[PDB]
Ligand binder design. Structure first.
Ligand SMILES: *[C@@H]1O[C@H](CO[C@@H]2O[C@@H](C)[C@@H](O)[C@@H](O)[C@@H]2O)[C@@H](O[C@@H]2O[C@H](CO)[C@@H](O)[C@H](O)[C@H]2NC(C)=O)[C@H](O)[C@H]1NC(C)=O
Ligand SMILES: CC1=C(C#N)[C@@H](c2ccc(C#N)cc2S(C)(=O)=O)NC(=O)N1c1cccc(C(F)(F)F)c1
Ligand SMILES: *[C@@H]1O[C@H](CO[C@@H]2O[C@@H](C)[C@@H](O)[C@@H](O)[C@@H]2O)[C@@H](O)[C@H](O)[C@H]1NC(C)=O
Length: 218
């Protein structure tokens, strides 16, 4: 996240860190005790048997007793088409269920088909890069963005921070975009690189996929 701030610890208890060989590589969102969702680009060429799904995290450079760690039992995909920037969404089935508590909670989703208009206020977040020469988050970052339709396909929800250079970056892939308390996005791609100040950021449009998500989580 470029131009963000620290989340208060555990403010977003559905936020997930996907890790390999102890390193964070993408965000995800807890959508049932035993399912997460993320971006398909996050898992395309990954070794999934080795992915660790880390719930209840805040500061990744710390040992944190609030964490719960799962493996991926299987993945569900839905026609990911990267060249056309379509269906950038995967669900990972965990090898058990999370214990729900203060730090680990299942997110809420919009209705199938809900579109958000221009100007809707949302929050992005993640443990990605902080931008050119400013390192990487330890602590989960968050960022106020605004929904925009200009320079955005209908197959995305796009957001923009007007008047300053801010947005999602590498490592924020797969993280939720929360709008009116619901997960309307999954961080998918950037245009003009991170925080161009020119092009909106693009998220996989979760509301286009709720039927598919429900078909898996019930
Ligand atoms: C910046 O964002 C916060 C949080 O946004 C709200 O909560 C997110 C998780 C998501 O649901 C967003 O769509 C929501 O907008 C804003 O805080 C809200 O501010 C209003 C009063 O302005 C208040 O009644 C709410 O309780 C606040 N919600 C929370 C969780 O704090 C904040 O206003 C945004 N700021 C700007 C300048 O855009
Ligand atoms: C991490 C990343 C890529 C990969 N792999 C890549 C990409 C992302 C999504 C999609 C789709 N749909 C396709 C690609 S690509 C370049 O075809 O492989 N393009 C892209 O911009 N990024 C990327 C970089 C910075 C932030 C983000 C995100 F998700 F946070 F928005 C994504
Ligand atoms: C579920 O998986 C947990 C984590 O397994 C560990 O991480 C995976 C990715 C591999 O790296 C593996 O070697 C590790 O064991 C376990 O600690 C946990 O008990 C498992 N839960 C089950 C089977 O219910």
């Amino acid at each position: 996240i470029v131009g963000g701030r620290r989340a208060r610890p555990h403010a977003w208890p559905f936020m997930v860190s996907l890790q390999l060989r102890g390193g964070h590589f993408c965000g995800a969102t807890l959508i049932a005790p035993n399912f997460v969702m993320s971006a398909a680009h996050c898992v395309a060429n990954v070794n999934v048997r080795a992915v660790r799904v880390v719930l209840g995290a805040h500061n990744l450079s710390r040992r944190e007793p609030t964490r719960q760690v799962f493996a991926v039992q299987r993945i569900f995909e839905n026609g990911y088409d990267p060249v056309n920037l379509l269906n950038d969404i995967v669900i990972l089935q965990l090898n058990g269920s999370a214990t729900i508590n203060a730090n680990v909670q299942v997110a809420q989703l919009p209705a199938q088909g809900r579109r958000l208009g221009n100007g809707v206020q949302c929050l992005a977040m993640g443990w990605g890069l902080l931008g050119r020469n400013r390192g990487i988050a330890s602590v989960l970052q968050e960022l106020n963005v605004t929904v925009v339709t200009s320079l955005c396909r209908r197959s995305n929800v796009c957001t923009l921070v007007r008047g300053r250079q801010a947005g999602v970056c590498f490592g924020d892939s797969g993280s939720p975009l929360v709008c009116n308390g619901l997960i309307h996005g999954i961080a998918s791609f950037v245009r003009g690189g991170c925080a161009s100040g020119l092009y909106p950021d693009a998220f996989a449009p979760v509301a286009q996929f709720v039927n598919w998500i429900d078909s898996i989580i019930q």
